User: Fold Poly [ADP-ribose] polymerase tankyrase-2 from Homo sapiens.
Amino acid sequence: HSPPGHHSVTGRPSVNGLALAEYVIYRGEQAYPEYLITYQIMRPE
Amino acid sequence: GTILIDLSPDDKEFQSVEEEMQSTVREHRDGGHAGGIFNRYNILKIQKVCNKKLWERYTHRRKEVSEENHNHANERMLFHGSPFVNAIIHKGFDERHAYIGGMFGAGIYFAENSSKSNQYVYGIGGGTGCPVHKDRSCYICHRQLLFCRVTLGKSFLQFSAM
Ligand SMILES: COc1cc2ncnc(N3CCC(CN4Cc5ccccc5N(c5ccc(F)c(C#N)c5)C4=O)CC3)c2cc1OC
Ligand SMILES: [Zn+2]
Assistant:
């Protein structure tokens, strides 16, 4: 369940200034899995 | 009900989705423990997920939320990583499998940094890494992320100590 009169939570990093946000929803119908991306991580050179 | 449409690398949608994946990599404070050590990905495939039922349920909820928030769905495109991506594309996200251990309550997590989502593709904390080699930094095994349309509506701002 979302906080009263909220639809989601924004988890905003306040210590790592380069970290972008995370988000939480409480109903699966509030997201659509639009793109499936298949990938490898690359070993740095 | 789901069909997967392969996007050509020449397709502007392939290119824009790749750029959002690549441009949102960052370093992690675990030094790569959960997700592995990397600055960029090798994108092998991008598929458009097409499911009329799921899309209609999404747009119905989006209209409800918009109406509750001065005609503003606050819709984002965000990454989701978990071992369940092949389930989610067929049946949609299921809030009954909510992340109870998460820092922001028991729900479905998404991330702006693709590399944050990459930390979860093999499970919480990267689990035991890839199925084949048990390597959270595997450079061989194929990984999958979802790039998702997410309605945030009125979003509670929780400052995180991370
Ligand atoms: C086959 O079994 C399943 C089928 C499912 N079908 C649809 N939806 C599912 N879940 C997938 C898990 C979702 C909650 N989680 C769980 C989780 C498990 C392991 C690794 C990561 C996660 N995360 C997660 C946590 C922090 C994060 F930053 C991210 C991202 N990006 C993702 C969830 O949001 C809620 C929706 C399903 C989850 C299933 O197993 C638990
Ligand atoms: Zn492997």
Residues 3 and 9 of chain A are 8 Å apart (CA to CA). The radius of gyration of chain A is 16 Å. The interface with chain B takes residues 1-3, 5-16, 18-44 of chain A (CB under 8 Å). Chain A has one domain: 1-45.
